[PDB]
Amino acid sequence: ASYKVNIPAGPLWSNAEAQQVGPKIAAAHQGNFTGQWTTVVESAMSVVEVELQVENTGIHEFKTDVLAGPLWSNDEAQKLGPQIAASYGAEFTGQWRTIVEGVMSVIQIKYTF
Amino acid sequence: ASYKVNIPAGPLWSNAEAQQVGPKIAAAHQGNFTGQWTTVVESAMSVVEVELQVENTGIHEFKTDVLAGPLWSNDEAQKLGPQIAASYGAEFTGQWRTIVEGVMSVIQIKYTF
Ligand SMILES: CC(=O)N[C@@H]1[C@@H](O)[C@H](O[C@@H]2O[C@H](CO)[C@@H](O[C@@H]3O[C@H](CO[C@H]4O[C@H](CO)[C@@H](O)[C@H](O)[C@@H]4O)[C@@H](O)[C@H](O[C@H]4O[C@H](CO)[C@@H](O)[C@H](O)[C@@H]4O)[C@@H]3O)[C@H](O)[C@H]2NC(C)=O)[C@@H](CO)O[C@H]1O
Ligand SMILES: CC(=O)N[C@@H]1[C@@H](O)[C@H](O[C@@H]2O[C@H](CO)[C@@H](O[C@@H]3O[C@H](CO[C@H]4O[C@H](CO)[C@@H](O)[C@H](O)[C@@H]4O)[C@@H](O)[C@H](O[C@H]4O[C@H](CO)[C@@H](O)[C@H](O)[C@@H]4O)[C@@H]3O)[C@H](O)[C@H]2NC(C)=O)[C@@H](CO)O[C@H]1O
Ligand SMILES: CC(=O)N[C@@H]1[C@@H](O)[C@H](O[C@@H]2O[C@H](CO)[C@@H](O[C@@H]3O[C@H](CO[C@H]4O[C@H](CO)[C@@H](O)[C@H](O)[C@@H]4O)[C@@H](O)[C@H](O[C@H]4O[C@H](CO)[C@@H](O)[C@H](O)[C@@H]4O)[C@@H]3O)[C@H](O)[C@H]2NC(C)=O)[C@@H](CO)O[C@H]1O
Ligand SMILES: CC(=O)N[C@@H]1[C@@H](O)[C@H](O[C@@H]2O[C@H](CO)[C@@H](O[C@@H]3O[C@H](CO[C@H]4O[C@H](CO)[C@@H](O)[C@H](O)[C@@H]4O)[C@@H](O)[C@H](O[C@H]4O[C@H](CO)[C@@H](O)[C@H](O)[C@@H]4O)[C@@H]3O)[C@H](O)[C@H]2NC(C)=O)[C@@H](CO)O[C@H]1O
Structure with missing residues (x-):
């Protein structure tokens, strides 16, 4: 689709x-x-x-980190990660980290192509 | 704006x-x-x-790699990089590389927030 x-x-x-x-x-x-x-x-x-x-389908994959806005806990990150990854046309791997305390976090996404 | x-x-x-x-x-x-x-x-x-x-303005930045579609040469990458980075709401740093020959390349972008 x-x-x-x-x-x-x-x-x-x-x-x-x-x-x-x-x-x-x-x-x-x-x-x-x-x-x-x-x-x-x-x-x-x-x-x-x-x-x-x-x-998106294919036999190749590429993982990287993208902005996810501020995520205040792993609980919140695991809940929102799949949707944030979808907004990038990718999947959430489950890995993530805050890069600027109180300001911004990133999630690791996986592209399939 | x-x-x-x-x-x-x-x-x-x-x-x-x-x-x-x-x-x-x-x-x-x-x-x-x-x-x-x-x-x-x-x-x-x-x-x-x-x-x-x-x-996008701010006192912080974050660099990362994202899909750029296949890029066939540095001349093309340097020409399209800024526009592809803009499509991600970021700036192109000038660095890029093909991750899958004849299929996919990535560009390094710099987010400012
Ligand atoms: C995956 C899936 O199939 N999901 C569906 C659900 O989509 C569906 O729930 C309804 O979904 C539709 C959208 O698809 C909802 O309608 C849209 O509502 C938004 C929000 O509008 C409200 O909030 C605004 C801001 O507060 C207010 O300004 C507004 O007055 C409302 O209070 C609107 O932005 C949308 O309008 C745009 O899109 C429509 C086309 O859909 C255009 O015609 C408009 O011109 C405009 O561009 C929609 O109006 C709807 O509210 C959801 N219904 C409920 C009950 O939540 C669900 C049930 O049908 O089924 C799922 O499977
Ligand atoms: C905006 C803001 O300031 N928010 C902060 C919150 O970030 C903070 O909550 C903690 O946030 C950190 C990240 O900054 C969390 O630690 C990371 O967790 C992820 C997820 O790991 C879990 O889930 C994975 C998938 O299921 C599992 O594999 C894993 O075992 C865990 O169960 C990891 O991906 C991260 O690890 C990677 O990155 C680090 C850094 O680069 C590397 O060192 C690692 O090797 C790895 O690559 C982190 O471990 C932490 O869990 C959050 N804490 C809680 C309690 O939720 C919050 C509290 O301090 O404060 C807010 O202000
Ligand atoms: C950054 C900046 O200021 N640059 C401007 C230039 O924008 C400007 O050049 C004109 O730009 C407008 C768009 O802003 C062009 O008009 C749009 O054209 C596209 C493409 O349409 C063609 O191609 C389609 C596919 O082949 C055909 O289906 C179509 O029939 C045409 O052949 C359309 O998609 C756009 O339509 C959408 O947007 C308009 C609103 O802009 C809606 O009304 C429509 O319903 C639809 O949603 C536009 O029609 C225009 O062609 C450009 N002009 C020229 C000569 O290239 C430039 C010159 O004014 O100035 C720069 O500064
Ligand atoms: C889809 C496909 O198969 N396309 C291939 C093309 O990729 C290929 O063209 C070459 O592509 C490689 C990348 O794969 C190019 O090398 C990279 O160049 C960029 C840009 O480097 C220049 O510009 C920078 C900014 O101005 C300068 O700092 C730099 O000094 C150069 O002037 C670099 O960013 C890359 O570097 C990264 O990757 C390499 C390799 O992993 C690391 O070693 C580095 O540390 C860094 O992480 C690369 O150096 C190369 O220039 C392209 N060649 C030409 C002639 O354009 C094409 C031809 O082989 O074939 C297509 O099929």
């Missing part, structure tokens, strides 16, 4: 640029550029519509 | 749950949940509207 969402691309100055960059942004997020896009902040930010898969 | 995009949150089964989960997804992406959300794939995926900043 698939769905669509707009993904930031930084400022895009013309449709010609957007049509060429959109596919690259989509590939980075394991999706497909739909061709639709728009500038959301004049001369500062544009977004591209990307079709994503509900479930 | 701020702009909005819908961010995946995995399946959300009720507004009651979405109102509790949306803020957490938003925080992980350095944004604010607006309260608006919707299921895009019945019983499988929902998205939450998040207000993002054109430029």
Whole structure:
């Protein structure tokens, strides 16, 4: 199954640029550029519509840490981790850590491609 | 300046749950949940509207690697890196590498929060 969402691309100055960059942004997020896009902040930010898969499959995997906002306990981290990982189109491994006390934590995610 | 995009949150089964989960997804992406959300794939995926900043500012930073899709050369990576990093709400550091020949590459991004 698939769905669509707009993904930031930084400022895009013309449709010609957007049509060429959109596919690259989509590939980075394991999706497909739909061709639709728009500038959301004049001369500062544009977004591209990307079709994503509900479930990413494949024989390869890559693990890394991404921002998860502040997580105050392992209990909270184990509960929210799966959903935060899903927001990155990945899975939560269960590993995580606060990188700045009282400010920010990160969760380890696993990409499948 | 701020702009909005819908961010995946995995399946959300009720507004009651979405109102509790949306803020957490938003925080992980350095944004604010607006309260608006919707299921895009019945019983499988929902998205939450998040207000993002054109430029993420703050006194802290965090570097990490994320998927960039396959990058075929340093010339291409240096050209697309900034835009791919922007799609993650971060900056490109210039460092990158292919993790699976002919299939996937990753770029190092720098979050500021
Ligand atoms: C950062 C910055 O300020 N840059 C601006 C540039 O944005 C601007 O160039 C124009 O940018 C607009 C978007 O902001 C372009 O209009 C959008 O075009 C895309 C693509 O549409 C084409 O391709 C599709 C797929 O092939 C076709 O289906 C479609 O028919 C077209 O052939 C559309 O997806 C957008 O539509 C969405 O957004 C608009 C709102 O913007 C909604 O109304 C729609 O319902 C839909 O949701 C836009 O139509 C425009 O083409 C760009 N112009 C040129 C000449 O490239 C640039 C020049 O003004 O200025 C920079 O500063
Ligand atoms: C925003 C803020 O300030 N919040 C803090 C809270 O962070 C803090 O709660 C503790 O937070 C730390 C992380 O900073 C927790 O420790 C980490 O736990 C995870 C999860 O480990 C469990 O689950 C895994 C999966 O099931 C199991 O494999 C594992 O055995 C555990 O059961 C680990 O992934 C981390 O370990 C990794 O990272 C560290 C650091 O790089 C490495 O050294 C390790 O080798 C490993 O790679 C940590 O162990 C800790 O559990 C939290 N404590 C509690 C009680 O919940 C809170 C309290 O201090 O204060 C808030 O303010
Ligand atoms: C995985 C799965 O299948 N899950 C489904 C659940 O989705 C479903 O529960 C309903 O889900 C729908 C969305 O899919 C909910 O409707 C949306 O509600 C949000 C929130 O709206 C409230 O909160 C806002 C902020 O406080 C207020 O402004 C607003 O007035 C409400 O109080 C809205 O943001 C959505 O609106 C957007 O999307 C719709 C399309 O869905 C557009 O038409 C709108 O224009 C807008 O863009 C929706 O209105 C609904 O509330 C959920 N129902 C309940 C009872 O929780 C559940 C039951 O049907 O079944 C699960 O399986
Ligand atoms: C999908 C696919 O198969 N594509 C491959 C291409 O990858 C391949 O092109 C080469 O790709 C490698 C990466 O896999 C390139 O090497 C990396 O380059 C970046 C950038 O380095 C430059 O820029 C930095 C910033 O300006 C400078 O600091 C640096 O000095 C350079 O000027 C580096 O960040 C990488 O370094 C990391 O990885 C290596 C290897 O793991 C570590 O040793 C380092 O410590 C660090 O962690 C790499 O050095 C390489 O430049 C690409 N080659 C060319 C000619 O573009 C292509 C050709 O082989 O084939 C495709 O199929």
